[PDB]
């Protein structure tokens, strides 16, 4: 019932670089998604102790939010734009694994998903 | 508390059935309520669940989709004008509740102008 660590945001070990794509999915995607009247649920870990959510990270193995995301951004964790672009589709599948076609938060997810395939549409050239 | 919704059936109004209602019913409302954008306008804002304690402090006249579905259904329209009066309230809800630019708001100028373009081919009175 206990909530994990959050995902990790800091790779002492890996190389950093900054590239035009890698700037924009801070300073355009993830500030326009977190932005998003929306985006409240996705904005940080999901705390399935308050939200009283005990099976939640039984199904849930992959846990991802955008307060991570935004971190993992910061920290440079990222080297290429698809880890980035993987972290937000794995926390739209999360969405809906856990939930139910139909549910407000799924359709919360949906509208969040769309403008992100939106915004990924003009991403910088590699 | 959110309030009760908008009143949908007047036993006191007499009901006609006029091209442009069904129009209004067959066409608008459908092609509105199928809209990928629609969801968070077919039923009135549930503020307690959002935790917007000031919505119905600011919007004193709410209106949604299905409150104009259940309108037309219940002919509680004599003119096209007062189904017509209740979209656009529900789209000045969305810009006064919220702020320019805000994403709610794209969403329901998207809503405004594909209803415009319905309302365009309107049948005549």
């Given at each position: 019932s206990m909530n994990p660590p959050p995902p990790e945001t800091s790779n002492p070990?890996?190389?950093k670089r900054q590239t035009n794509q890698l700037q924009y999915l801070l300073r355009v995607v993830l500030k326009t998604l977190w932005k998003h009247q929306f985006a409240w649920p996705f904005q940080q870990p999901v705390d399935a102790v308050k939200l009283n959510?005990?099976?939640?990270?039984?199904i849930i193995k992959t846990?991802?939010?955008m307060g991570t995301i935004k971190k993992r951004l910061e920290?440079?964790?990222?080297?290429?734009?698809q880890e980035c672009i993987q972290d937000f589709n794995t926390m739209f599948t999360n969405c809906y694994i856990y939930n139910?076609?139909?549910?407000?938060?799924?359709?919360?997810?949906?509208?969040?998903?769309?403008?992100?395939l939106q915004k990924i549409?003009?991403?910088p050239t590699e």
């Open positions: 070990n890996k190389p959510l005990p099976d939640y990270y039984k846990p991802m939010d920290n440079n964790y990222y080297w290429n734009a139910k076609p139909g549910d407000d938060i799924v359709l919360m997810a949906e509208a969040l998903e769309k403008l992100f549409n003009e991403l």
